[PDB]
Symmetry: D5
Subunit: 191 residues, 10 copies
């Protein structure tokens, strides 16, 4: 492991506004990307995460951030799942691309593929506008991720990108930051 | 990668209530453990994270969860930092053990060692009472982690361990859960 | 390659009468098994093949033969597809097991996994009651297989198993067979 | 294995109209080819297959499809077998080339060579006009193949080559086909 | 390459008195065996050699020697060739076994397989009653072997086996032999 | 093994007309060559073979065929043996070159060297005018070769080279030959 | 090992005059360098050695020699330690660079890294103005090195560099030297 | 490398009081040993080192420490050198064993052998009573080592062995030591 | 290479008093043995060396020393050479065994085989009664060895075996010897 | 190994006329060189050999031959030994170079280094004016070599170089030589 590792390249077929479209990581150059894998279409926590991000999508897009979801399921299954009502555990209409990883290459490239299970864990990745990986969140299967936390992290990374100050534990917009220098730091710590 | 993989074993010297003590992962068997690495003593975000957890430690201990912090610094340096006032970027008295990983073996075993830097990234691990790794959170250097989110995750893993239902995106105590069955799931969805 | 080789072992989660059940190749010992792979749930030729076998299942069961279908899709997707009406390209309720091969291990063991696509081709295998592979039919994706030809082949293998005569090109029940001896063959040829 | 694999190249001596001639797979480019191996000259199912295709050869050649048979036997044996009356288990005059694979190279290249037996199984290959393998049929020794089914498959591959449609289970000329699109498929399925 | 090496074991299906039988090299222990390969059934020199040996078989049997012929052709082709009249280049009925080597293992074990041709050269082997290889004669394709020379060699080997004298160039029964000692040799030479 | 294999190249010191001369296989291009190995100078069968060929040398030279003998003995030993009277088991004057293979390289190249004994078996090779190996005759130690059979083989190979018909079993000059074609063969077989 | 081996190259972050600066071995070309590793900041023998050399730096600088100290600790820790009073086991302000070897590459390149402990032993290296290693002194952890012996060695190497006579056991400035010739040596011995 | 490494074992022929005797490292267990290599007999700095230690040997023996010198020279050369007067660059009688390392194995085991020169550098090793290596001093060829400094080190190691306190820079007997504890160290530092 | 190398074991066929006998190195245990190789029978220096030792054989046997000669020639060639008069460059009757090394294994084991030539150089070996190699003399081809020098060496080795003194340059029986001790040597050198 | 092998190159420091000089094998091109190794300075047989050759150096120089001696001892020990009286086991008066092989490279290149002892055996090499090794004499440690024998060999090699006749066993100047031809040899033998 090294600092400022580029996110691994991916490309594949996604369902975007009900259509099959080719999609690649570099389509998101210039924007932050929340790229997240979920285990399996037609399961349990997975739709709740896709819906949680989808229903709050503008809170990301308004800060130059896009969201893409990915599983090992086919694009046909993705579409069938979109075409399933929420009340039956479907997604209904969704504005987040659903990337298909049938070959498992994308999941393996991101280190999130479970060899025993044939699908991914709940792996979420925050990739900056330069394609550099900034954050990795990996959850075991029974526990969903947090849109609140993902937003906070995106906010924090964008802030430190712009200002060069660093973000303390629990930082949210408006919170104090630190000048990352042995002298400069005392402005924060003495305060 | 497989599911329900054990957290790698570790042992080393920790500073615990101002004294050097031997500490090992298995000391926490039967308890949840938040095990987190931070880059470096006498730096910037790191003290804020140790303090953030330390000052809320009873919120964890009261739910059968302990917290351990680790860096590549020596135990002598850990103790010197504890003995540095908070207003100077020190820790002050701290109730969380500070584990020393001078050899880098613990860091490398957890995949958080930065070869180019000679220290870790901000890697946090939630390990259950059986020693199984449940959650991994890796932040790049300039952005601190969240105690709130860490608590929510411990709560959720504990809840799913006890009930067998699964936790939707953003779950907190009191929130609805899902019966992970194609029929049972509809109690959640079909509202 | 050698003659009379065992069908590779497989086991996995299948949807059977709307429930998830573990299924094994060895569960079919004592019976012929038509074991076929299809590319993908919620596609085009695939449901027509599954439905064709399913709706004609008694033509197999009446001759001690079972049918199992398999794709790389999850068991959750299989059940979703069964729960999709036929008029929407679903399966509807179905009496043949749908085996899930999420890991791809079964498909690769049968040599039908397409590395570039992430799913199988249209590979059908006829396995006898002793677990020996008797017939392999591999179709490219746009052309479906034939239940009628599959039945003919099952009938032909069962017949040659029982009688030890051999079945000419295009043999169907009632057709002439050959005694596989340089002398006996002449009854057929002459 | 991959989507659209070229049929392996072959070349060798064939008996064509009672003469020894060099024959190459590439001689058939521009036309579909039914290329089939049979175990052994002077045996039992084998002549019935050669004769079945031969006597119906114009049903193939009239749809731009040629037919070639191959075994491990020598060209001298092929000729002797052609010169044996059908009533003695010979072929009589035959319009299908009989390719000789004495070295076993062709049979091994097609994966139909039986190491324990020294001859092929009953392996039939449908190769399109571009030299791409479209269909493989492999029978164990005691059961002959079907000219009817071979014709159906050639017809179906030619049809799908020409049209933006796919052929359901059991398709024959005149049968309904499917537009391989999530929306267009419903023209078929709605019935 | 060493002195008094055993003939390589072989076993396979032979045509014997018009039937298929399993035949093994070890079936001939206790007797000399002339074991010869010929290129191909239904060819030219080959039938002349098989017939020359078969028609003179008693010249071998009367001196405790058997004859077996082998090619890469199948047992079915061997029998078809036996059932072909001599006037048509057939064998007619034959009293020497015709061994089949479809797999080529026997030919390769005897070093007579031609990789480029897929059949043997004209390789003849004289094997003694103890299974030891005594003589190897390899002819290129256009020139047949000699039954008379084969008989001379068998006689010579049998004579030297019995008497421990050695056989000069061109020895035939009745010819002078040599006592293989520096002193005893002069009985032969010194006149 | 392949058809029409070149005889391995050799060169070395030979005794020619009582003198040491360097001799090379390529010196015999344009002629057939009977190149034969014999075990050892001053032994038993060996002189009989060298003398048998030497005394009939013109029967070979008359038909554009030369003869060369070879053993592992030195050229000095060869000369001593030539200078030894025939009545003492010597050669007397000899018109066939005696090639020396002290290093064993030529013997090994011809596959006739016996590792246990340190000399060759009785290996004879018929090599055509293009240096192509036509016939190999290997006898175990106690039994001499035949000048008659060697002559017959040279005649047969020269005949088939010239006429492109093939030589049946036991062919001698004046004997019937075969046209190696399925139709042309019947001229011979019909008798 | 061979005669006249160059000191392994090193570069890294050092604390110099209270600030972080990149420092390289080649910055010292043209001068002798006493380059020494110590186990750990905030420990026991270590500050005594750093202080002993630092406080006597002019005894080196006045003979074209510089001194650099190195441990596996970070530069932030080095600076904290400099900012700790001597009476608390700190360094106080200091005039010799403290090089950080967080990655352990420098320590490993010098053969002084202890794999079991995660820090160096007490390894001191005398490097000449051409970058050639002249002297290696390795102490186990509980015993500190000597500034006075180090000065003696630097003085001796400079003297032999200049004069081409050699320095007997215990040589100090003013002591007798030897002409390294079988005949010339007798001026010393006899 | 690791802490508390044993000195590598050695054995060889030494000159001890004018006689050749086998000497082993294990002969010195129970006592400290100053074991030093010197380049070459009959050279320049080398005798001054042997003599410096030899003439002050009682300062070591009286603190339970022995001294052994070693070079690559033979025992015969060692003895010749001992028998050379000091005024001619010899040793005269010497009470320190001179170990011979003709094979270079001992020198190589200690990492002091110069491959280009065929002798050692000036390598000195302080080995404790348990055979553990405590100190290594390696000098380039033109500069002799120090008896004063060697005694200081032996004294310091013996002191820290007995008392568990540690020895500051420049420690000599009578000097202040440090308690190696974060609290106890202040007894030293406060002064 | 080490002190007291055993002579490599050998066994082979030798000519001994005109008969072929198996001879082994171990047959000479308890006696010194002069074991020498010579290039080739029927050559030039070689017979002079065999004759020179043979004619003085009693000078060796009188001091419990045997002599054996070896070349790569066959035992038959050796006997022919014995049976050749000395006036023709033969040996005549000889009392030294002539060992044959047809396979070259003995020569190669003794490191005297010339790969380019197919025979040995002039290598002589003095082997003691315990089978240990004491002396090796290797001459290039044009120069013979010395019986005088060989006797001197055998005498010298026997003397030093018996007395444990050592033999100066040019020692012959009756010459001064040296006590191999730094003190004892002076008895010799003081004169 | 092969005929006319060049002597391995060597270079190193030698004591020549009491001074250290670099010496190289190639310095002796155009002259014969007797190059000999001896075990060790200050020992027993060694000085007797060095003295025996050195004192008779003109018997070599007058026939265009030089002498060089070599051991593993240093040049300093070589000089010390030269500077030691003969009556004390020293060399004294010497005029042949004493080459030092401290690294053992020369000894190893000549195959005379003893791994167990750390010095050479008594290996003497006669190298001709073209640098070709002509003679190797290897003695075990207790037995010195012969100046007289070495002179005989040098004389013989020079004679054969010049005349192209070969030198019988025991040849000395004035002795009969042999013309190395099967005919010419009889001038010597046939008397």
């Amino acid at each position: 492991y090294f600092q400022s590792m580029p996110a691994p390249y991916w490309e594949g077929t996604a369902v975007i506004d009900g259509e099959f479209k080719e999609l690649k990581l570099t389509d998101y150059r210039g924007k932050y990307l929340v790229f997240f894998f979920y285990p399996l279409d037609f399961t349990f926590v997975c739709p709740t995460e896709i819906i949680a991000f989808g229903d709050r999508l503008e809170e990301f897009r308004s800060i130059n951030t896009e969201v893409v979801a990915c599983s090992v399921d086919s694009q046909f299954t993705h579409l069938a799942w979109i075409n399933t009502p929420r009340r039956q555990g479907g997604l209904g209409p969704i504005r987040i691309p659903l990337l298909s990883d049938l070959t498992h290459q994308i999941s393996k490239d991101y280190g999130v593929y479970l060899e025993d299970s044939g699908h991914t864990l709940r792996g979420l990745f925050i990739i900056d506008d330069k394609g550099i990986l900034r954050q990795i969140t990996l959850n075991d299967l029974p526990v969903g991720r947090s849109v609140d936390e993902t937003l906070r992290l995106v906010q924090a990374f964008q802030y430190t990108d712009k200002h060069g100050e660093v973000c303390p534990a629990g930082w949210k917009p408006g919170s104090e930051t630190i000048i990352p220098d042995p002298a400069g730091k005392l402005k924060y710590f003495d305060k």
